[PDB]
Design a protein around this ligand. Structure first.
Ligand SMILES: Nc1ncnc2c1ncn2[C@@H]1O[C@H](COP(=O)(O)O)[C@@H](O)[C@H]1O
Ligand SMILES: Nc1ncnc2c1ncn2[C@@H]1O[C@H](COP(=O)(O)O)[C@@H](O)[C@H]1O
Lengths: 332, 335
């Protein structure tokens, strides 16, 4: 049960399940739309576009109805979050899962939108996409926006023969600049994926933004983690204390006794609290010498550029050799 | 029916202290020395855990080092009460390494709050022995007069004094959440006239489960979180969070069916709440999450980060009267 590939000419429906970014960052919003329109995609603005309710776009009900309208719209190929936030999980009881299951569509975003990507996967079994959100990902200036775009086409639009190899970008940035307007130019940081623990795993990939997962854990909206799953996790803009708590949360729930491997994203603007420790090192301490293949600094996270990763499908990861391959169809 | 219970606390008892997360014994020495002195004066003895004075940036020590500190207190038969120095983020790291069997064969008063919730609930969930949402040494007993005396009174009344049941938990007359007077006193905190808030009318009776909501999201689903059962009274508090964060947490409960099981909610005050401009109160955000579901709710309960602090047993039957703003403990928490 799979969504149709994106085509030029298709309509991307956009919704704001948490922060009211289309209100507070209008320039980046307009740039992001223009970028996609120039590429050849239409943008249907969700009913809360341009609305402001302080920390959020609107009420729980109104946010549900904004997304639902998109889900129920036959004219919309792809559904994309404008931005993350804290509050996607509020929507979960009210989403029209059956409407989605009866007419599957591409569901894309990241960060707080993990609540919905995972919820829709758990309820319908249809793969969803950890990938660009319209404002942060496509409002980005050159050069990085073009790399993210290349990855978005690779996953959603291109014919891809299986296995589909996910390649590492040459450069990245987590630099906190050029939000609304460009001033200076982002440092090209030279890229590497890190072989933290050597080895290989294949199995169904599950995860997204770990902080956000903690807001849906235990519910019907969190897909049950199974023996042999590959855990994919990322966090942004947290400190060492926060990610230790999240790693231990995983440990004590028995997650690391089930997963065959771990893909850890880069951590945008990580605050190491003076320790000079890297996020994977904190994870290693939690793992206590449990030998799970661990590939870190994967470029599907809040750093630019961003890969678009299908969730809920068979993946093969080789930590030693730093490869990610998607083994099963995630689209039509 | 009857169940294991920790011995009441007695004057002269040793209180074991440990730092399962933030290194407050290093970073706030004057509050720490003053908190020690406050309890020493009252007649108690403090046994300082192996990581007292130590500094590992955001934490007191490594996971293993911190498990070691707490386990030595648990195994020490001369310790009557085990009290965290302060919270943080990282208590939940210790849970796979705690000696639950030794706690269980010499149960002690386990007390603290905030991040220590992972430990308080972890020990209850593993051993069935009630633990206590109450003072942590540094924030609670390092508090300057007058509030520290109120906190101390509740601590004594609940843990040392003999109490007939039902045990009425009196509303504190005054409170503050002001952030002054941490290491040293620059002026008097405001004595704010206090009130509990009858958010939604009605009564509930059942086992009280909860603590620091944010912390609970660190242990949720694990063997260390007790399963919420039909009839429970949920007790929750948070501190120094914004509206976005709490809505997430409330939604987290909602989507887990928690509000379908609980007979009532006790919500603590929220220290230094950031409403993000909405002018909304934390219970107003909870209520939206509740939607059309009616649940008796008593809010601004003084078992939280605000001063002063009530000591509340966890895992025991309570009656909460939201309409009349009363809380009674209905079954023994100590012997
Ligand atoms: N006001 C801002 N200034 C600069 N970057 C921002 C701002 N708001 C959001 N962002 C960026 O976009 C991300 C928003 O992602 P999230 O809120 O986690 O979906 C942040 O981590 C930043 O990378
Ligand atoms: N530097 C400080 N200034 C004022 N209050 C503090 C300071 N450090 C800790 N606190 C108080 O100590 C409480 C305990 O922290 P925690 O147990 O981590 O939630 C915090 O909520 C504050 O009430």
């Amino acid at each position: 049960p799979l969504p149709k590939s994106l085509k030029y000419g298709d309509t991307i429906g956009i919704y704001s399940p948490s922060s009211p970014v289309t209100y507070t960052s209008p320039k980046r919003f307009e740039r992001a739309k223009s970028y996609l329109l120039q590429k050849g995609f239409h943008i249907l603005e969700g009913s809360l576009t341009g609305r402001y309710d302080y920390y959020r776009s609107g009420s729980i009900q109104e946010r549900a109805k904004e997304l639902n309208a998109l889900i129920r719209n036959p004219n919309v190929s792809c559904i994309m979050s404008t931005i993350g936030g804290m509050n996607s999980n509020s929507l979960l009881p009210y989403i029209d899962y059956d409407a989605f299951q009866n007419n599957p569509k591409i569901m894309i975003g990241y960060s707080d939108a993990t609540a919905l990507l995972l919820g829709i996967y758990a309820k319908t079994g249809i793969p969803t996409f950890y990938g660009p959100a319209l404002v942060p990902s496509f409002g980005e200036f050159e050069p990085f926006v073009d790399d993210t775009y290349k990855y978005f086409l690779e996953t959603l639009l291109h014919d891809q023969a299986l296995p589909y190899n996910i390649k590492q970008p040459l450069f990245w940035s987590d630099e906190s600049i050029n939000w609304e307007e460009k001033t200076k130019e982002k440092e090209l940081r030279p890229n590497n994926w890190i072989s933290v623990t050597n080895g290989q795993a294949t199995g169904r990939v599950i995860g997204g933004n770990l902080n956000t997962i903690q807001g849906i854990w235990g519910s019907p909206y969190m897909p049950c983690i199974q023996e042999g799953d590959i855990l994919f996790i990322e966090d942004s803009s947290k400190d060492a204390a926060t990610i230790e708590r999240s790693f231990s949360f995983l440990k004590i729930n028995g997650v690391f006794d089930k997963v065959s491997g771990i893909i850890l994203g880069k951590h945008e603007q990580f605050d190491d609290c003076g320790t000079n420790r890297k996020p994977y090192e904190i994870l290693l301490e939690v793992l206590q010498n449990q030998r799970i293949p661990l590939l870190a600094d994967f470029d599907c996270c809040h750093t630019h550029p961003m890969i678009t990763m299908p969730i809920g499908v068979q993946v093969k990861m080789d930590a030693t050799n730093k490869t990610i391959h998607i083994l099963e169809k995630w689209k039509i």
